[PDB]
Structure 1
Amino acid sequence: VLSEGEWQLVLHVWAKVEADVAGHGQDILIRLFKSHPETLEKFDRFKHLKTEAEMKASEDLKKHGVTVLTALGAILKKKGHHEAELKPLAQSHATKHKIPIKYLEFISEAIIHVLHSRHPGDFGADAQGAMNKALELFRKDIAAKYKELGYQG
Protein backbone atom coordinates (compact mmCIF):
# COMPACT_ATOMS: atom_id res chain seq x y z
CA VAL A 1 0.00 0.00 0.00
CA LEU A 2 1.45 3.39 -0.94
CA SER A 3 1.45 6.15 1.63
CA GLU A 4 -0.14 9.50 0.92
CA GLY A 5 3.32 11.00 0.54
CA GLU A 6 4.24 8.35 -2.03
CA TRP A 7 1.05 9.00 -4.00
CA GLN A 8 1.84 12.72 -4.01
CA LEU A 9 5.25 12.01 -5.54
CA VAL A 10 3.64 9.76 -8.18
CA LEU A 11 0.93 12.23 -9.16
CA HIS A 12 3.23 15.21 -9.05
CA VAL A 13 5.39 13.73 -11.78
CA TRP A 14 2.35 12.39 -13.62
CA ALA A 15 0.94 15.94 -13.83
CA LYS A 16 4.12 16.80 -15.76
CA VAL A 17 3.52 13.90 -18.17
CA GLU A 18 0.12 15.15 -19.03
CA ALA A 19 1.63 18.21 -20.64
CA ASP A 20 2.74 16.03 -23.57
CA VAL A 21 0.94 12.75 -23.24
CA ALA A 22 1.62 11.80 -26.88
CA GLY A 23 5.42 12.41 -26.75
CA HIS A 24 5.69 10.38 -23.58
CA GLY A 25 3.60 7.56 -25.10
CA GLN A 26 5.90 7.43 -28.21
CA ASP A 27 9.05 7.38 -26.10
CA ILE A 28 7.67 4.70 -23.83
CA LEU A 29 6.42 2.35 -26.55
CA ILE A 30 9.57 2.79 -28.59
CA ARG A 31 11.73 2.02 -25.56
CA LEU A 32 9.59 -1.03 -24.79
CA PHE A 33 9.87 -2.33 -28.40
CA LYS A 34 13.63 -1.67 -28.62
CA SER A 35 14.55 -3.05 -25.23
CA HIS A 36 12.19 -6.08 -25.49
CA PRO A 37 11.44 -6.92 -29.15
CA GLU A 38 9.15 -9.81 -28.17
CA THR A 39 6.66 -7.08 -27.05
CA LEU A 40 6.40 -5.59 -30.56
CA GLU A 41 5.48 -8.98 -31.90
CA LYS A 42 2.29 -8.88 -29.77
CA PHE A 43 1.01 -5.96 -31.85
CA ASP A 44 -0.28 -6.90 -35.29
CA ARG A 45 -0.97 -3.20 -35.49
CA PHE A 46 2.79 -2.28 -35.19
CA LYS A 47 4.93 -5.25 -36.07
CA HIS A 48 5.65 -3.89 -39.58
CA LEU A 49 7.85 -1.25 -37.91
CA LYS A 50 11.49 -2.28 -38.20
CA THR A 51 13.49 0.87 -37.21
CA GLU A 52 13.26 3.49 -34.50
CA ALA A 53 12.74 6.16 -37.21
CA GLU A 54 9.77 4.24 -38.59
CA MET A 55 8.35 3.95 -35.08
CA LYS A 56 8.80 7.70 -34.48
CA ALA A 57 7.08 8.45 -37.81
CA SER A 58 3.99 6.32 -37.07
CA GLU A 59 0.96 8.43 -36.17
CA ASP A 60 -0.98 5.33 -35.24
CA LEU A 61 1.77 4.35 -32.71
CA LYS A 62 1.52 7.89 -31.27
CA LYS A 63 -2.24 7.50 -30.99
CA HIS A 64 -1.90 4.21 -29.17
CA GLY A 65 0.66 5.71 -26.80
CA VAL A 66 -2.01 8.23 -25.78
CA THR A 67 -4.55 5.40 -25.28
CA VAL A 68 -2.13 3.56 -23.02
CA LEU A 69 -1.04 6.54 -20.95
CA THR A 70 -4.61 7.84 -20.54
CA ALA A 71 -5.67 4.46 -19.09
CA LEU A 72 -2.62 4.41 -16.79
CA GLY A 73 -3.18 8.01 -15.63
CA ALA A 74 -6.81 7.21 -14.73
CA ILE A 75 -5.53 4.22 -12.67
CA LEU A 76 -2.83 6.22 -10.89
CA LYS A 77 -5.27 8.99 -9.98
CA LYS A 78 -7.40 6.37 -8.10
CA LYS A 79 -4.45 5.88 -5.68
CA GLY A 80 -4.97 2.15 -5.44
CA HIS A 81 -8.81 2.23 -5.54
CA HIS A 82 -8.65 1.09 -9.13
CA GLU A 83 -10.71 -2.14 -9.30
CA ALA A 84 -13.18 -0.81 -11.88
CA GLU A 85 -10.32 0.22 -14.12
CA LEU A 86 -8.30 -2.98 -13.92
CA LYS A 87 -11.11 -5.45 -14.61
CA PRO A 88 -11.46 -4.72 -18.24
CA LEU A 89 -7.74 -4.09 -18.78
CA ALA A 90 -6.75 -7.38 -17.15
CA GLN A 91 -9.49 -9.18 -19.08
CA SER A 92 -8.39 -7.87 -22.46
CA HIS A 93 -4.70 -8.22 -21.74
CA ALA A 94 -4.92 -11.78 -20.47
CA THR A 95 -7.53 -13.21 -22.75
CA LYS A 96 -7.45 -11.22 -26.01
CA HIS A 97 -4.04 -9.59 -26.36
CA LYS A 98 -2.22 -12.43 -24.55
CA ILE A 99 0.28 -10.21 -22.73
CA PRO A 100 2.33 -11.95 -20.01
CA ILE A 101 2.65 -10.16 -16.67
CA LYS A 102 6.37 -10.03 -17.37
CA TYR A 103 5.70 -7.66 -20.30
CA LEU A 104 3.90 -5.33 -17.89
CA GLU A 105 7.11 -5.32 -15.92
CA PHE A 106 8.93 -4.31 -19.08
CA ILE A 107 6.64 -1.42 -19.86
CA SER A 108 6.87 -0.31 -16.21
CA GLU A 109 10.63 -0.06 -16.65
CA ALA A 110 10.14 1.93 -19.84
CA ILE A 111 7.72 4.35 -18.12
CA ILE A 112 10.18 4.94 -15.24
CA HIS A 113 13.05 5.51 -17.65
CA VAL A 114 11.15 8.04 -19.81
CA LEU A 115 9.85 9.93 -16.73
CA HIS A 116 13.40 10.15 -15.47
CA SER A 117 14.65 11.48 -18.80
CA ARG A 118 11.88 14.06 -19.18
CA HIS A 119 11.35 15.18 -15.55
CA PRO A 120 14.59 14.82 -13.60
CA GLY A 121 13.72 17.68 -11.15
CA ASP A 122 10.41 15.92 -10.26
CA PHE A 123 11.73 12.39 -10.54
CA GLY A 124 14.53 12.07 -8.04
CA ALA A 125 15.05 8.84 -6.20
CA ASP A 126 12.14 9.38 -3.81
CA ALA A 127 9.71 9.81 -6.70
CA GLN A 128 11.32 6.95 -8.65
CA GLY A 129 10.77 4.62 -5.70
CA ALA A 130 7.18 5.81 -5.26
CA MET A 131 6.40 5.33 -8.98
CA ASN A 132 8.00 1.90 -8.86
CA LYS A 133 5.67 1.07 -5.96
CA ALA A 134 2.64 2.36 -7.88
CA LEU A 135 3.54 0.30 -10.93
CA GLU A 136 4.16 -2.73 -8.76
CA LEU A 137 0.70 -2.31 -7.24
CA PHE A 138 -0.75 -2.13 -10.78
CA ARG A 139 1.06 -5.36 -11.70
CA LYS A 140 0.11 -7.12 -8.47
CA ASP A 141 -3.54 -6.37 -8.97
CA ILE A 142 -3.56 -7.25 -12.64
CA ALA A 143 -1.68 -10.49 -11.83
CA ALA A 144 -4.42 -11.51 -9.34
CA LYS A 145 -6.99 -11.13 -12.12
CA TYR A 146 -4.83 -13.05 -14.56
CA LYS A 147 -4.55 -15.86 -11.98
CA GLU A 148 -8.35 -15.92 -11.54
CA LEU A 149 -8.68 -16.38 -15.33
CA GLY A 150 -5.98 -19.02 -15.67
CA TYR A 151 -3.26 -16.83 -17.21
CA GLN A 152 -0.74 -15.98 -14.48
CA GLY A 153 1.50 -18.87 -15.59
Structure 2
Amino acid sequence: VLSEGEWQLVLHVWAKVEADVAGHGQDILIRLFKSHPETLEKFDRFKHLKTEAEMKASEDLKKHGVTVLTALGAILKKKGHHEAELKPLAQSHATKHKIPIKYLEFISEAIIHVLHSRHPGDFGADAQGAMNKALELFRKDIAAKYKELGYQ
Protein backbone atom coordinates (compact mmCIF):
# COMPACT_ATOMS: atom_id res chain seq x y z
CA VAL A 1 0.00 0.00 0.00
CA LEU A 2 1.24 3.43 -0.94
CA SER A 3 1.63 6.12 1.67
CA GLU A 4 0.05 9.57 1.21
CA GLY A 5 3.56 10.94 0.58
CA GLU A 6 4.08 8.35 -2.14
CA TRP A 7 0.77 9.19 -3.79
CA GLN A 8 1.69 12.88 -3.71
CA LEU A 9 4.91 12.14 -5.63
CA VAL A 10 3.03 10.03 -8.18
CA LEU A 11 0.29 12.61 -8.75
CA HIS A 12 2.72 15.51 -8.87
CA VAL A 13 4.55 14.07 -11.83
CA TRP A 14 1.25 12.89 -13.34
CA ALA A 15 0.00 16.45 -13.35
CA LYS A 16 2.99 17.27 -15.54
CA VAL A 17 2.00 14.48 -17.93
CA GLU A 18 -1.48 15.86 -18.29
CA ALA A 19 -0.07 18.98 -19.89
CA ASP A 20 0.78 16.86 -22.98
CA VAL A 21 -1.19 13.61 -22.76
CA ALA A 22 -0.83 12.85 -26.44
CA GLY A 23 2.98 13.37 -26.65
CA HIS A 24 3.49 11.11 -23.73
CA GLY A 25 1.23 8.40 -25.09
CA GLN A 26 3.20 8.27 -28.32
CA ASP A 27 6.54 8.09 -26.59
CA ILE A 28 5.27 5.36 -24.26
CA LEU A 29 3.71 3.14 -26.90
CA ILE A 30 6.69 3.52 -29.25
CA ARG A 31 9.08 2.60 -26.46
CA LEU A 32 6.91 -0.39 -25.61
CA PHE A 33 6.78 -1.56 -29.23
CA LYS A 34 10.47 -1.08 -29.85
CA SER A 35 11.62 -2.67 -26.60
CA HIS A 36 9.15 -5.55 -26.71
CA PRO A 37 8.00 -6.24 -30.28
CA GLU A 38 5.63 -9.01 -29.20
CA THR A 39 3.45 -6.27 -27.77
CA LEU A 40 2.93 -4.62 -31.13
CA GLU A 41 1.61 -7.88 -32.50
CA LYS A 42 -1.36 -7.72 -30.07
CA PHE A 43 -2.65 -4.66 -31.99
CA ASP A 44 -4.27 -5.44 -35.26
CA ARG A 45 -4.58 -1.63 -35.59
CA PHE A 46 -0.85 -1.07 -35.36
CA LYS A 47 1.07 -4.14 -36.45
CA HIS A 48 1.51 -2.66 -39.96
CA LEU A 49 3.92 -0.15 -38.41
CA LYS A 50 7.48 -1.30 -39.15
CA THR A 51 9.63 1.71 -38.19
CA GLU A 52 9.78 4.33 -35.46
CA ALA A 53 9.12 7.09 -37.99
CA GLU A 54 5.97 5.27 -39.14
CA MET A 55 4.86 4.95 -35.55
CA LYS A 56 5.45 8.63 -34.83
CA ALA A 57 3.48 9.55 -38.00
CA SER A 58 0.40 7.53 -37.06
CA GLU A 59 -2.43 9.66 -35.79
CA ASP A 60 -4.37 6.51 -34.84
CA LEU A 61 -1.50 5.49 -32.61
CA LYS A 62 -1.43 8.94 -31.06
CA LYS A 63 -5.17 8.71 -30.40
CA HIS A 64 -4.81 5.37 -28.69
CA GLY A 65 -2.03 6.74 -26.54
CA VAL A 66 -4.48 9.31 -25.22
CA THR A 67 -6.99 6.56 -24.49
CA VAL A 68 -4.43 4.58 -22.51
CA LEU A 69 -3.03 7.48 -20.48
CA THR A 70 -6.49 8.88 -19.79
CA ALA A 71 -7.54 5.57 -18.29
CA LEU A 72 -4.31 5.31 -16.29
CA GLY A 73 -4.63 8.82 -14.95
CA ALA A 74 -8.15 8.15 -13.70
CA ILE A 75 -6.81 5.04 -11.94
CA LEU A 76 -3.87 6.81 -10.34
CA LYS A 77 -6.05 9.65 -9.04
CA LYS A 78 -8.12 7.09 -7.12
CA LYS A 79 -5.00 6.35 -5.05
CA GLY A 80 -5.55 2.69 -4.64
CA HIS A 81 -9.35 2.85 -4.40
CA HIS A 82 -9.57 1.96 -8.08
CA GLU A 83 -11.58 -1.29 -8.14
CA ALA A 84 -14.39 0.08 -10.33
CA GLU A 85 -11.94 1.50 -12.83
CA LEU A 86 -9.94 -1.76 -13.10
CA LYS A 87 -12.81 -4.18 -13.52
CA PRO A 88 -13.60 -3.35 -17.11
CA LEU A 89 -9.92 -2.95 -18.04
CA ALA A 90 -8.95 -6.28 -16.57
CA GLN A 91 -11.93 -7.94 -18.21
CA SER A 92 -11.15 -6.59 -21.68
CA HIS A 93 -7.40 -7.09 -21.45
CA ALA A 94 -7.69 -10.67 -20.22
CA THR A 95 -10.53 -11.97 -22.33
CA LYS A 96 -10.70 -9.86 -25.48
CA HIS A 97 -7.26 -8.43 -26.09
CA LYS A 98 -5.39 -11.37 -24.56
CA ILE A 99 -2.66 -9.34 -22.88
CA PRO A 100 -0.44 -11.18 -20.41
CA ILE A 101 0.40 -9.52 -17.08
CA LYS A 102 4.04 -9.49 -18.21
CA TYR A 103 3.11 -7.04 -20.95
CA LEU A 104 1.67 -4.74 -18.27
CA GLU A 105 5.09 -4.92 -16.65
CA PHE A 106 6.60 -3.89 -19.97
CA ILE A 107 4.33 -0.86 -20.43
CA SER A 108 5.04 0.12 -16.78
CA GLU A 109 8.72 0.17 -17.64
CA ALA A 110 8.00 2.34 -20.69
CA ILE A 111 5.92 4.78 -18.64
CA ILE A 112 8.67 5.15 -16.05
CA HIS A 113 11.30 5.67 -18.74
CA VAL A 114 9.33 8.37 -20.55
CA LEU A 115 8.49 10.17 -17.27
CA HIS A 116 12.16 10.33 -16.40
CA SER A 117 13.05 11.66 -19.86
CA ARG A 118 10.36 14.32 -19.84
CA HIS A 119 10.21 15.32 -16.14
CA PRO A 120 13.51 14.69 -14.47
CA GLY A 121 13.12 17.49 -11.90
CA ASP A 122 9.86 15.96 -10.71
CA PHE A 123 11.00 12.39 -11.23
CA GLY A 124 13.96 11.90 -8.93
CA ALA A 125 14.51 8.61 -7.17
CA ASP A 126 11.84 9.17 -4.56
CA ALA A 127 9.21 9.78 -7.25
CA GLN A 128 10.50 6.93 -9.40
CA GLY A 129 10.10 4.51 -6.54
CA ALA A 130 6.62 5.83 -5.72
CA MET A 131 5.53 5.50 -9.38
CA ASN A 132 7.00 2.00 -9.49
CA LYS A 133 4.88 1.13 -6.44
CA ALA A 134 1.74 2.65 -8.01
CA LEU A 135 2.20 0.68 -11.19
CA GLU A 136 2.96 -2.46 -9.20
CA LEU A 137 -0.30 -1.98 -7.36
CA PHE A 138 -2.07 -1.60 -10.70
CA ARG A 139 -0.53 -4.87 -11.92
CA LYS A 140 -1.23 -6.72 -8.68
CA ASP A 141 -4.88 -5.81 -8.78
CA ILE A 142 -5.31 -6.60 -12.47
CA ALA A 143 -3.47 -9.93 -11.92
CA ALA A 144 -5.99 -10.88 -9.24
CA LYS A 145 -8.85 -10.32 -11.65
CA TYR A 146 -7.03 -12.28 -14.35
CA LYS A 147 -6.64 -15.13 -11.89
CA GLU A 148 -10.38 -15.03 -11.10
CA LEU A 149 -11.11 -15.30 -14.85
CA GLY A 150 -8.59 -18.13 -15.51
CA TYR A 151 -5.98 -15.96 -17.23
CA GLN A 152 -3.31 -15.67 -14.38
Give the shorter-chain TM-score range: over 0.9
C-alpha separation in 1, matches of 2:32 and 2:21? 16
Instruction: Tell me the CA shift for residue 74 of structure 1.
Output: 0.0
Shift of 1:131: 0.0
Please list every run of 5 or more consecutive structure 2 residues that lacks an aligned counterpart in the other structure: none
Once residues 130 and 45 of structure 2 are traced to their aligned partners in structure 1, the CA distance between those partners, rounded to angstroms, is 33
1:39 corresponds in structure 2 to 39
Q: How many residues align?
A: 152
Deviations along 1:38-81, one digit per CA (max 9) or x if unpaired, are 00000000000000000000000000000000000000000000
With normalisation by structure 2, the TM-score equals 1.00
Which structure 1 residue ranges, 5 or more long, are not aligned?
A: none
Paired position in structure 2 for 1:73? 73
Q: Name the Cα RMSD after superposition.
A: 0.1
For residue 124 of structure 1, report the CA deviation from its aligned partner. Answer: 0.1
**Percentage identity across paired residues of the two chains:** 100
2-structure distance, mates of 1:8, 1:88: 26
Give the Cα separation in 1 of the matches to 2:82 and 2:120. Answer: 27
Deviation per CA, 1:89-147: give whole Å up to 9, x if none: 00000000000000000000000000000000000000000000000000000000000
**Aligned-partner Cα distance in 2 for 1:29–1:113:** 11
SS of the aligned residue for 2:47 comes to coil
Residue 18 (structure 1) shift: 0.2
* TM-score normalised according to structure 1 size: 0.99
Match of 1:11 in 2: 11
> 2:90 & 2:117 partners in 1: Cα distance?
29
Report runs of 4+ in structure 1 exceeding 2 Å deviation: none
Give distance in 1, aligned partners of 2:54 and 2:86: 31
Aligned counterparts of 1:94 and 1:84: Cα–Cα separation in 2: 16
The Cα of 1:31 is off from its aligned counterpart by: 0.1
CA distance in 2 between partners of 1:37 and 1:105 (Å): 14
Q: Which residue is equivalent to 1:95?
A: 95
